[PDB]
């Protein structure tokens, strides 16, 4: 009961927190994927196009922005989750190593010249995984902030 | 009211879920746009296989799977812009736009590139620049967004009104 408001605003404010991180962390995963996939149209193209040799450069940054990523999801895990939200938050978790694995392998796989592996890795599928457990963790996290915000929940959902 | 410890008025509640509504439709259409990034570039490299390459076969459904997710990233774009902004965030909304139609423009050239095979004319765009431009755009969005919902909720008269 004691100090609810200030609860509220702080458990407000790391639920948006949260979903920021993981919002970064899938837009770094989505650009990683973007960059291995320029890295793989600069092996495609002829010597004598300008833009071929770029391709180091290219699996370079797919590697830059996948270590952000996991930096980004670092900081989403050292946030607690709230009660309602440690299913969802697990799911994530399982979902995000996957797609994080295919693509060190696709960063792999183009590093050693095994552009057949990269092309048949079921990439997308793994994403679709991934994003199907965010939009799942933001369901559940929207429930908990409109019942915070709206002083609808017990205490016990805010680790109280 | 008391609506609640947060939102003394409801009012304000709604103001402030504005907001992150806005936010929240914005984080959609640059996820489609990288989405559409990801097909496009998809479809492109296959263009550059040989037909005998079964992994040319996807090329179409790729570039067709990138029209869907670019008109997904508008159908967002245009329900963000039918949410009325709050007078601080015109100036960081303005600039949004300028960046997401140039974005925008681009993916749908590059589109029509690839609808006939035009491989080159889809190298030489610059979208990456493009991109870059959105996602500094989108960055600073959202910290001004943050912003201003924490000043919101910590202010509590009632109060905030949608600009005009
Ligand atoms: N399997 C990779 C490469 C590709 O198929 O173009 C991906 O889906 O990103």
Redesign the pocket.
Known sequence: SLHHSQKSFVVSNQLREQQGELTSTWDLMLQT?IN??RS?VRMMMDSSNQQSNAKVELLDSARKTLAQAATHYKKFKSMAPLPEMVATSRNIDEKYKNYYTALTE?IDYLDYGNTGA???????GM?NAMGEAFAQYALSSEKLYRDIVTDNADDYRFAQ
């Open positions: 994927r291995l996939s793989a696709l990269y092309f048949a890795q079921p990439t997308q994403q």
